[PDB]
Symmetry: none
Subunit: 56 residues, 8 copies
């Protein structure tokens, strides 16, 4: 599902700064409008990204 | 995040049948009652369980 | 007060499925204590949530 | 005992999200460590903090 | 979580004698299965009991 | 690529303050975000903007 | 020897995820300072625990 | 801002030695140069590095 940074953090039971550090490490982001629009995330793709970090 | 089966499925980009199927394999359930009760899930704990299943 | 889903729907004169909607929309839930006892609610907090829905 | 966020949550019959919310409210942390090692908690110290929070 | 007497003491950072005295004062216990299974505890229920001892 | 202020400054071999100064001078921003939203930049767009500014 | 989590994984030829699950299973941990110092391990103590998992 | 070792220490309310020790621990340096070059720092990047050090 479509989530904002705050909603993503809550889904992971994590800090917002925990979210931002993951972004720096190549964590996927969705879209918006270009200046005047919050960063959006696909929870499914973030979960897949989190999982493949330590997949064999 | 505390979510229902439909929400958890949305979060994972999965079918409800996949969530039921994960539960049968031992996926953690947060307070979820029995009868007259919808089940609540810890999205964060289900995500933890997910990654550790094919983790190294 | 400490109420279950049945008691809460009762207090709101609503269907249980309606209570399940409010939960999916972000309505506050207590911390029961695991997959043994039901979801619990704080009636006071649910009322404030209900009221702050169209408080602006 | 020394536990991770998921264990502390299991111990309290709570969500991982509830643990994070408690962390923001001043809930004691044993080994926050540093980005590289997850956060460790003193279950005894968290319980003492929980009990002192709604006590006379 | 489901714990034995030794695990519950460690969770409380306490003496097993401390636990046995809580039992006498009415601290909640789980069930088992006729000769073999030790006394089991719901950590969540025990914390709830610990806190209610002088809650407002 | 989509980067935060620190990453952009790292990419340019510049201080974060120079990035803020470029922002005030009309450097393109990708995700302005709400509050609690960090600012996201398009590295490719900031580079094009950089080259145009003293190009002949 | 005294090692941090990254160092113990390398000693074991393992992922960080593997070390964390062992911790969850009761693998010994040292002490520190209180949220600042990383989790520390006694390699000797950890090896004894690894071996005693199915020593006769 | 771009500041020298003495300025950064003053900004942090810290000893120059602490700054050196943070440098050994991986703290970002801006204009480092070689010899006949004193070290410049991005105060904004050092602050970010500081906060994420014991952040969740």
């Amino acid at each position: 599902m479509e989530v904002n940074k705050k909603q993503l953090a809550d889904i992971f039971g994590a800090s917002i700064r925990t979210i931002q550090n993951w972004q720096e490490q190549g964590m996927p982001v969705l879209r918006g409008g270009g200046k005047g629009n919050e960063v959006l995330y696909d929870s499914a793709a973030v979960i897949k990204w989190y999982a493949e970090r330590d997949a064999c």
